[PDB]
Design a protein around this ligand. Sequence first.
Ligand SMILES: CC[C@H](C)[C@H]1C(=O)N(Cc2cccc3ccccc23)C[C@@H]2N(C(=O)NCc3ccc(Br)cc3)CCC(=O)N12
Ligand SMILES: CC[C@H](C)[C@H]1C(=O)N(Cc2cccc3ccccc23)C[C@@H]2N(C(=O)NCc3ccc(Br)cc3)CCC(=O)N12
Ligand SMILES: CC[C@H](C)[C@H]1C(=O)N(Cc2cccc3ccccc23)C[C@@H]2N(C(=O)NCc3ccc(Br)cc3)CCC(=O)N12
Ligand SMILES: CC[C@H](C)[C@H]1C(=O)N(Cc2cccc3ccccc23)C[C@@H]2N(C(=O)NCc3ccc(Br)cc3)CCC(=O)N12
Ligand SMILES: CC[C@H](C)[C@H]1C(=O)N(Cc2cccc3ccccc23)C[C@@H]2N(C(=O)NCc3ccc(Br)cc3)CCC(=O)N12
Ligand SMILES: CC[C@H](C)[C@H]1C(=O)N(Cc2cccc3ccccc23)C[C@@H]2N(C(=O)NCc3ccc(Br)cc3)CCC(=O)N12
Ligand SMILES: CC[C@H](C)[C@H]1C(=O)N(Cc2cccc3ccccc23)C[C@@H]2N(C(=O)NCc3ccc(Br)cc3)CCC(=O)N12
Ligand SMILES: CC[C@H](C)[C@H]1C(=O)N(Cc2cccc3ccccc23)C[C@@H]2N(C(=O)NCc3ccc(Br)cc3)CCC(=O)N12
Ligand SMILES: CC[C@H](C)[C@H]1C(=O)N(Cc2cccc3ccccc23)C[C@@H]2N(C(=O)NCc3ccc(Br)cc3)CCC(=O)N12
Ligand SMILES: [Mg+2]
Ligand SMILES: [Mg+2]
Ligand SMILES: [Mg+2]
Ligand SMILES: [Mg+2]
Ligand SMILES: [Mg+2]
Ligand SMILES: [Mg+2]
Ligand SMILES: [Mg+2]
Ligand SMILES: [Mg+2]
Ligand SMILES: [Mg+2]
Lengths: 178, 180, 178, 176, 170, 170, 170, 171, 171
Amino acid sequence: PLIPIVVERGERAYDIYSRLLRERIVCVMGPIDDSVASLVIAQLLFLQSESNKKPIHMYINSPGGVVTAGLAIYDTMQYILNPICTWCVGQAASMGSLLLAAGTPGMRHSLPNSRIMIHQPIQAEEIMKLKKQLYNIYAKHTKQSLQVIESAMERDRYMSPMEAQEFGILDKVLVHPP
Amino acid sequence: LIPIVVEQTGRGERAYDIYSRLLRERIVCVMGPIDDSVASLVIAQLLFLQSESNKKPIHMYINSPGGVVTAGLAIYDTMQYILNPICTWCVGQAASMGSLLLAAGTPGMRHSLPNSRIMIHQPIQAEEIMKLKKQLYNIYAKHTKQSLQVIESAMERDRYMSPMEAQEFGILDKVLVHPP
Amino acid sequence: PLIPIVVEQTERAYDIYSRLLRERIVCVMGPIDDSVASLVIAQLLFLQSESNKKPIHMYINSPGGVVTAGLAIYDTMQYILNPICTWCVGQAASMGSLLLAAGTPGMRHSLPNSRIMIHQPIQAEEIMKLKKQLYNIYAKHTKQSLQVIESAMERDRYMSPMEAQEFGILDKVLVHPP
Amino acid sequence: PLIPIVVEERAYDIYSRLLRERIVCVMGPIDDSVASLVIAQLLFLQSESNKKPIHMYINSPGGVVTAGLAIYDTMQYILNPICTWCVGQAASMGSLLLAAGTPGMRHSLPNSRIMIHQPIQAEEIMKLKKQLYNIYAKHTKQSLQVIESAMERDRYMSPMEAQEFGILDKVLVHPP
Amino acid sequence: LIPIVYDIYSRLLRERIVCVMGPIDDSVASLVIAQLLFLQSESNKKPIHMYINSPGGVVTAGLAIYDTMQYILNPICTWCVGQAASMGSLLLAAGTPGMRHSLPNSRIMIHQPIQAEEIMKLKKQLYNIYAKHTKQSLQVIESAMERDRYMSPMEAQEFGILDKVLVHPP
Amino acid sequence: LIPIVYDIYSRLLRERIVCVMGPIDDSVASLVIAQLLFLQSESNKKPIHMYINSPGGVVTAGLAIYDTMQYILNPICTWCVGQAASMGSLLLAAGTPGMRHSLPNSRIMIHQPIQAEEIMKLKKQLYNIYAKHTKQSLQVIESAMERDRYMSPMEAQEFGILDKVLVHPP
Amino acid sequence: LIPIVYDIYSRLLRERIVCVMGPIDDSVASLVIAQLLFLQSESNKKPIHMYINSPGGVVTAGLAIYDTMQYILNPICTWCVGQAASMGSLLLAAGTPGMRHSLPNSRIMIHQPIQAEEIMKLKKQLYNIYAKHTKQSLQVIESAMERDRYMSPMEAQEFGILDKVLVHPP
Amino acid sequence: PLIPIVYDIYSRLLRERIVCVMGPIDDSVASLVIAQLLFLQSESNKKPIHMYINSPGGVVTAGLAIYDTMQYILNPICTWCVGQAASMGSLLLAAGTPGMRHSLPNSRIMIHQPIQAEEIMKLKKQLYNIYAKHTKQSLQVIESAMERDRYMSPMEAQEFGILDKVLVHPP
Amino acid sequence: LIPIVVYDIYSRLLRERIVCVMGPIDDSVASLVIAQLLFLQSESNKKPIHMYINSPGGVVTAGLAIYDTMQYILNPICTWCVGQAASMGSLLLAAGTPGMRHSLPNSRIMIHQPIQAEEIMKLKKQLYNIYAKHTKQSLQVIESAMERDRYMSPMEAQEFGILDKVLVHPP
Ligand SMILES: CC[C@H](C)[C@H]1C(=O)N(Cc2cccc3ccccc23)C[C@@H]2N(C(=O)NCc3ccc(Br)cc3)CCC(=O)N12
Ligand SMILES: CC[C@H](C)[C@H]1C(=O)N(Cc2cccc3ccccc23)C[C@@H]2N(C(=O)NCc3ccc(Br)cc3)CCC(=O)N12
Ligand SMILES: CC[C@H](C)[C@H]1C(=O)N(Cc2cccc3ccccc23)C[C@@H]2N(C(=O)NCc3ccc(Br)cc3)CCC(=O)N12
Ligand SMILES: CC[C@H](C)[C@H]1C(=O)N(Cc2cccc3ccccc23)C[C@@H]2N(C(=O)NCc3ccc(Br)cc3)CCC(=O)N12
Ligand SMILES: CC[C@H](C)[C@H]1C(=O)N(Cc2cccc3ccccc23)C[C@@H]2N(C(=O)NCc3ccc(Br)cc3)CCC(=O)N12
Ligand SMILES: CC[C@H](C)[C@H]1C(=O)N(Cc2cccc3ccccc23)C[C@@H]2N(C(=O)NCc3ccc(Br)cc3)CCC(=O)N12
Ligand SMILES: CC[C@H](C)[C@H]1C(=O)N(Cc2cccc3ccccc23)C[C@@H]2N(C(=O)NCc3ccc(Br)cc3)CCC(=O)N12
Ligand SMILES: CC[C@H](C)[C@H]1C(=O)N(Cc2cccc3ccccc23)C[C@@H]2N(C(=O)NCc3ccc(Br)cc3)CCC(=O)N12
Ligand SMILES: CC[C@H](C)[C@H]1C(=O)N(Cc2cccc3ccccc23)C[C@@H]2N(C(=O)NCc3ccc(Br)cc3)CCC(=O)N12
Ligand SMILES: [Mg+2]
Ligand SMILES: [Mg+2]
Ligand SMILES: [Mg+2]
Ligand SMILES: [Mg+2]
Ligand SMILES: [Mg+2]
Ligand SMILES: [Mg+2]
Ligand SMILES: [Mg+2]
Ligand SMILES: [Mg+2]
Ligand SMILES: [Mg+2]
């Protein structure tokens, strides 16, 4: 995996991901662990410092990951004052779909062929407390009841972008820009 | 060991790695197995090239045996999303998700060199695996302009196509031995 | 993972973590070992030299780690004269929660969905000497008795941020900046 | 781990910046590779000073004896004052380096742990042990029998017990 | 170390008890099928006890055991001890009606943790077999199997997977 | 490398002694269950001795042994030697009342070191079983199990896990 | 752990049943061939039962079994339970006509998942053998084998791979 | 891995009431030793049992399982330290019937010992009491000696109270 | 694959009062050798025991465990060095009853020897004394000779005091 260099006062050379960061785009790609969370959180704090009002784009192609790391990203998204556009490309499963649903209302996007899953693939009470935290967060942003969330999360299935929009996880399914 | 080449940018010379220099020619490489990492890199390049011009064509170099479906679909959706014409170039082989990206190029601009091999056959719950298979049927039918019955039947065969067979089937438009 | 580069107007460019250090923010992320402790300690000494009075922000998302390495960070936090704001994001368990509680009083923070654990997952007497050192440090910074600390640390459980605030581990649970 | 860059305008990695503050790290297990780096830094810092002290940051569980002795001899060889700082722990060869600091300049932070117990043919191993006995006795100013007896017990001492024992001089909670 | 009395499992076979224990693969299916054919030869009318504590396994191997259970003429008692999940619960439910048992603290799961058309053809085969032996409709089976959960023995009896939950022998 | 007298474990079985040693998994549970069924076939009145030196193991496998202990009609003497932690202590407490034993230096732990709701259902099953056999309330069991500690044999006798701490035979 | 009756697989061979399990390699081929020669010596006319649940394996090893099946003069009943894919289905189809069986839920695949000319020569050998026992034309064989799919037992009977689909004995 | 037949040599050695405590002690070793002790007690609960000890130590609860069983059975137990008895091995050596604790001349004995913190310390005190009981020393002498990372000669262990006799030849 | 002979060939060797100490000596090897020595002494405390030695050495305490047992039993012990007897192997060779320590012509013998420091030295001095006792050389001749990293020929070892007879063929 070699990262390409692009060229953007004068001419500066970045690696393509750093150039993506200058377009206020943050990537949440692959499994989410403490390392990914810290990097995402760092980028969110940086982008808010450059403007606490210009939107931030969050590119999400993740199968999920560690819950506390995902929750670290979630809490930081709520904490910063910027509007956050989430973009599901490929898939958003487990904590990935939670972050997708955690975007600013009206700015949660998916491309047409993405797959979304809210099903989720340390002591016992302790695992259940984290589950209830996920129930509350999903209920809050999908605007569904806890009963619908608990029931839906019990089903080992993915949603298409259209059914995820009807469920309240995302707001727009775009084939091309509007 | 990746070679370094110099281009003059206007006020001086810049050194790139040869792949980064290829990106300055609006050519994106999709080579080897496609995973989330490849998809993110390709998508990043597609968004970058569109920003530099949403009307100059983008060349997609494809030499891939396939890969993860959702990662392939992420590239596919991004190809449709951007406004640029996309020329696809099959060199070596385009199998499984690779052939899907090849066929997803802008009509009339889907290319193969003479000795390439193309395969649309494809080498997690059960219903969900079938939903992805049905997403693949629809995309192939859409871009080859064949019926779903012909796509489902052809994908059931474990075989490769010649570039001339892929052109007749609708995966690509031109087989070039030299440039025109 | 590739680490992005950001640009600051001075035009300087750094890696995002080096830029985070310029905001007087130090990261304690993942398992704590001698290598992490030395890096954190180096950053604390550097930030104090740039000003022994501007606050230092300590980002904590850690499951714990080596006790002596954690204690090395703790002692250095007490040694420097700067006020230290601790920020629990994701989780602070074992030595992580000790560092969280060791922040300057009134400046110990957690985001809403963090998890905090003071339970802890060499000869026999020596292992017990370290445990009592941890009892003392927790008692000092939570302002609880040794009997309350020893009893609470025996329970294999996590606390919510609000529960950690009543226990005395942290001072504020913030959803947005005030 | 990613190592941060700091700017003094010149930019260095934070460990290179630490070297500029005349601080040398003896960090983790000590082997020939670590000794060489420490020795190189010690020779560098002595050239570059009009006898200003060198700070030796020690957080080590020990390591190979000959590598530890290589650092020890170099500490004695350079004719500079060396402040030793025990943070976290100094066990085995780590505690020998700690005690080998210039008298009056051996430090520990409050919660550090210090161990002089130690976790090639037989005679050859025993010769190195006496070499350790002699060095400890010299710098703690304890008798050889107190050192042999103390090293025989597998225990750590608190910083204040290490100050009474003669391994270090000062236990500091804040700078004085 | 396996104790000697025969070896304890061979002695269990002489008491007409067959163990379906752990993950089911082609090897397990071959062993169980071999035992079923033998016990039928020594008597095609004395019951066979099938002890089931399995998390599931390979579908075709599970179906191989199922078809052999259907093929032989003996009445088969299925006994869920510990757990019967995935193909394990299918074998449990495939016992002779009235002779499907579970102990009180067992867990039963019908949820299930090759080309695409082939995997779903196998799934419908599981739907029909479950529907046949639980006497539930195909929509009730398809809906229930989609839920990633275990049921208690009482709940599995009410669903039609087993017939009796015994604390002591009857 | 086991010694033969039979092999020493098989001869121990002839004294109606079954060993539960080390981590409990599906394999250990099946062997123990097989042995329990065998000894009660030889007698349903003579006591069976269960030697327990285990740090715990898989919950469903432990529950499989537990259910079989309750199912069989024999009185079961449990003997804690070394340690009985997690599922091991559950088996220890599940012995016939008055016949739950420990040697003086053993350690006993009821603390316990798949979806979420399912892990919690199994935890509640452990709460119920412990409450039943120690005759303590559910809040005393839930509270005690949250503590990561061992009990002395005398302390476990007072908690209700065992009945007798013997230094020599009486 | 293989139970003793001496071992259940050896006892099953005394019933003139040979198992073809798992991946077929030279080792399995030699074992099956040995059993076939043995069963022919005890009687050249009594049928031999060949139980097949195999995903396939090495071509030359499969062909070694095939050649031996035709070489011996006994009638051989083939039984597909679970699956017969690749070389497994070839052996299934190679049973004596009228004596090729499958249980209801089996899956059968004739698709197949050394220098180039060599691989193609082996492929036509498979085409010929299938064609002979399928009583289908070679173009129908080449075309069907190119399709990456399984057949139901009824679909395999109709294609000529097997003769009867039995749920119980007739 | 290769074991001679006379019965297995260890099985035959068991027929003269000699049980081996060999190498590192774990739950597996403890169970076999306990099994052997119960068996030999059934055969005669008054003829002595010989415990052959060459062990560097092992798991405490496993060693304590053997210890409790030694006290539980009604037989006199002769312990024989040959090679070494360190950590739990020396505890079993000292736990033999008084007057019947033996060592050969060149053996090495160590009482120094090379899960939560409170529990580790609880087991340590259990070892202090057991050593104190069988060596007839004070807890302070035991705690004090166990902190020293050293071995004893057989004569020094006889003087400490761990063993009773050091034999070069039989009496 | 171990051949069986009109039981297994090693079991037949034991019945010939021949004990093998082959390869590296560890606690496991030692207890089996000790087991065999005690067994043959029961079958006769006066008929000689043959000890076949082809070993590069091994664990000191395990070697001393066998050494102490060789001295403990009342039997005459013939030691036979074939191939090599190095480190603890050569000490066992020299520990045979005087006049009955043998080597075949092309064997190699080494007394050089390829846990805390003081205790390592205690074991070394124990080896010095045991060699000196059976070689009837002074401690300095043993200490000095063990310092050379070399092997001796059987003749070279006979004069030294390690062995008594070098035999091409039986006498
Ligand atoms: C929304 C942030 C507030 C405004 C505020 C605050 O709560 N914390 C605390 C904090 C620390 C660490 C991790 C945290 C994660 C979640 C929430 C809080 C965190 C620090 C932040 N700071 C900043 O964002 N500086 C700009 C900057 C950041 C990164 C980079 Br790269 C470059 C520039 C420094 C100045 C300041 O007031 N705050
Ligand atoms: C065709 C895109 C639209 C134009 C639009 C948009 O939908 N998203 C959303 C977006 C986010 C993340 C991943 C996405 C993947 C697929 C589609 C959308 C994605 C951002 C994009 N942006 C851009 O493309 N900026 C220029 C640039 C990109 C990369 C590099 Br390197 C350098 C420069 C920022 C400005 C902007 O409006 N859009
Ligand atoms: C709070 C520090 C004191 C003020 C004081 C002191 O006790 N030690 C000793 C010391 C050494 C090593 C690790 C220690 C960890 C804990 C405590 C002490 C440590 C050195 C420090 N020094 C400094 O901090 N120099 C500025 C600087 C540091 C790092 C970087 Br990167 C860039 C700039 C050099 C000048 C000076 O007096 N002290
Ligand atoms: C206190 C040192 C003496 C004064 C003296 C001396 O004995 N040796 C000898 C020497 C050689 C090799 C390894 C040794 C290791 C331990 C001790 C001695 C060593 C060299 C040293 N030298 C120096 O220290 N140069 C300064 C410098 C060092 C490193 C770097 Br990076 C940059 C600058 C060169 C100039 C000079 O006289 N000596
Ligand atoms: C249900 C039995 C039917 C009557 C019948 C039949 O369909 N097959 C076919 C068969 C072959 C291989 C595997 C099969 C798996 C599933 C179903 C059928 C299988 C063989 C059976 N035979 C028998 O069961 N012999 C008794 C015996 C068996 C095993 C052992 Br161990 C000891 C004794 C031999 C004589 C005979 O007619 N049948
Ligand atoms: C206490 C059991 C009852 C008595 C009763 C019964 O419920 N099951 C069912 C059963 C099957 C499999 C595993 C089970 C595990 C838990 C409970 C039930 C199980 C079989 C048992 N049988 C027996 O125990 N035979 C004696 C024997 C067993 C093993 C060995 Br080795 C040697 C001898 C055969 C005859 C019979 O009526 N029952
Ligand atoms: C002519 C047909 C008979 C098969 C014939 C024959 O061709 N070969 C040759 C042969 C060798 C090796 C593998 C072959 C594979 C395919 C065909 C032939 C093979 C030997 C066989 N023999 C036998 O079958 N002996 C009975 C028996 C066999 C196995 C066992 Br187990 C027990 C008893 C020995 C006596 C005999 O004339 N023939
Ligand atoms: C009163 C004297 C005996 C110690 C007494 C007793 O307390 N328990 C309890 C027991 C159970 C399990 C493990 C224990 C470990 C440590 C201590 C006690 C254990 C069983 C023992 N039994 C016996 O020793 N049978 C002889 C025998 C044993 C093994 C072999 Br192999 C061959 C023969 C069976 C009959 C009996 O009354 N007792
Ligand atoms: C007086 C001479 C004997 C050495 C004496 C004795 O000191 N111990 C103690 C002993 C125990 C364990 C390991 C020891 C290793 C080194 C020395 C002593 C050991 C046991 C031995 N016993 C015996 O040798 N029985 C003969 C025999 C043994 C094994 C086999 Br297989 C077959 C036959 C049983 C009865 C008996 O009085 N003694
Ligand atoms: Mg926001
Ligand atoms: Mg387009
Ligand atoms: Mg401070
Ligand atoms: Mg000095
Ligand atoms: Mg039936
Ligand atoms: Mg009962
Ligand atoms: Mg034929
Ligand atoms: Mg006793
Ligand atoms: Mg002698």
